[PDB]
RNA sequence: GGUGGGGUUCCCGAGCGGCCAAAGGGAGCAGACUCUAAAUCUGCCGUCAUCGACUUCGAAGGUUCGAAUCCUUCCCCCACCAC
């Protein structure tokens, strides 16, 4: 079996959630948002800001989007989510709407209303 | 400041000496190394000003069988090297306590480069981390960001538990090295200069450790002179 | 016969020696025999007549074999005697 | 007329020039020198490095090359010049061989020997 | 955050405080056997590689006439838990 120990929390990487949307009347894949940020993220950070800030989408089922972040460097990832111009036809819009530190307290205060809990049951069913 | 790469010309060599390198590991990642190749390091190495240290390495195989046969092949030898993603041949050659410097957990894995419980045995082990670099030359962008992301958690792993790190670029043919003040620079960018200065100078220690070890007879550190009772 | 190899488990009383190396100034130029050993001391007799009790780990020791002069750290002599004759597996990286 | 009075010393842009070596067989135009160091200033910087370090080429003629940068990041230039991997059918090699404050003392540590002066001739006679 | 446990030869696994006591099995090498090979048996079995002797029972300290074993500490490896 291939298994990773998870950090200690103080030597793992502090981390933020930004929740944002993706504002368009056009429809994306979740795979053509994970490509647009990964050349927006180097367009905006090269190797040394990409290495530094640690991106990853982690949500994208709506025009909304959960993406994971540094804690120091939220600010640099807002500032890489402004320069989006245009995708190949098209721009889209992103559009932040806050940056919490999960998904259950940041999932109630711009996203939803209610608490969901997905990843423990598809652990334990499947 | 010590490179490792591999020899296959010698105005590249002579390159390198021109430049600011006082000497490299010559590297011999295959199972069939003999005499042969060693006098031509020799020959290349008085060529013009130098001298190389040399060493072998091995690739996916059995578990500590290759732990034994390559102790054995390693007793010919001076320094080596063990590369390899699986973390279960990584936990015996960070065991073993008798590799120098260890490489390749990024490319094999791509999930993590060491873990928590590897750096601490490492600790007690006294074994050394080498950070490669033909790997950000061969890759794509975000595939630079993976392997530098893992490279940086990595070097915090490294700076926590006081890990040895040796840098090299992993070089394959002339024009695969770079310079030395350029990796300085680098691994300055990073995170620290000072830690970037004690990699280098890890990586004179650790050679000069071997050389020291293999140059006489010394047994577990005994220096052993003039009128010996050796039999 | 002692040799330079089980040194690291040869008894060391009734051994000349001299140290080259160590942390306090004043301890290097000493020359002496062995006269009692503790875990990590040594208790050596000098040829003026002075006792000085000198730590292992702190220094490097050159014991005078017959006609050898050989160079051991005292962090590879750490433990009691007794127990480095039971068994002591010692491995130093000077890093 | 169009003109621009340069900034004081005391507020300007501290500058340092990197001289440094395209090492290859092959040949460059100076343009295509522009536009892989472009390239690649995107590719380690992004919008905030290139406005950070100020990147330009400023000579070209021979596989050796000077280019300015700002005093305080000359590293970033440097591990910027390091990931050139590749360009269209083939690498190009860059390789520094220092960094100085001018022309004329970059121009006879590593490049040459005597000192050149040729912006004020061709300011002055043409 | 919690309970019941395990770490011994290259791999799976036993072992009264005591003469490598270290059951062992598979593996490697050699012998024997066969036209060749499989299977069975024999010795080395980690080393010298004929008897025999020495080292390793996760690591350190301590008790003892003497530690895989008894005590303490440091570790890791299992199994299962959100409802």
Known sequence: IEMLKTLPPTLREKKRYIAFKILYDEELKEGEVVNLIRKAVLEYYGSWGTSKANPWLVYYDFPYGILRCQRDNVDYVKASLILIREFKEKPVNIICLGVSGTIRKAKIKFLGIKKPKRWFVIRRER | ?231 | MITPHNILRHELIGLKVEIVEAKNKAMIGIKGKVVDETRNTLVIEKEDGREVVIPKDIAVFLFQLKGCKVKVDGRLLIGRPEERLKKKIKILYPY
Chains 1, 4 share one sequence.
């Open chain 2, 1 to 231: 400041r010590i490179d490792i790469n591999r020899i296959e010309k010698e105005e590249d060599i002579k390159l390198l000496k021109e430049l600011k390198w006082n000497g490299f590991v010559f590297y011999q990642y295959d199972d069939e190394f003999s005499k042969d190749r060693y006098e031509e390091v020799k020959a290349i190495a008085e060529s013009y000003k130098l001298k190389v240290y040399s060493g072998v390495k091995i690739k996916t195989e059995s578990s500590k069988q290759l732990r034994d046969k390559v102790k054995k092949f390693r007793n010919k030898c001076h320094i080596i090297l063990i590369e390899g993603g699986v973390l279960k041949i990584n936990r015996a050659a960070v065991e073993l306590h008798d590799v120098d410097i260890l490489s390749t957990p990024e490319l094999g894995r791509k999930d993590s480069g060491i873990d928590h419980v590897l750096a601490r045995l490492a600790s007690n082990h006294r074994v050394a981390i080498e950070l490669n670099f033909k790997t950000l030359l061969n890759k794509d962008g975000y595939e630079r960001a993976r392997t530098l992301l893992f490279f940086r958690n990595n070097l915090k792993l490294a700076k926590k538990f006081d890990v040895p790190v040796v840098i090299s670029t992993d070089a394959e043919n002339k024009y695969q090295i770079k310079n030395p003040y350029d990796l300085r620079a680098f691994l300055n960018t990073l995170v620290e200069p000072l830690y970037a200065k004690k990699i280098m100078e890890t990586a004179y220690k650790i050679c000069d450790f071997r050389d020291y070890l293999m140059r006489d007879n010394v047994v577990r550190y005994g220096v052993e002179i003039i009128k010996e009772e050796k039999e």
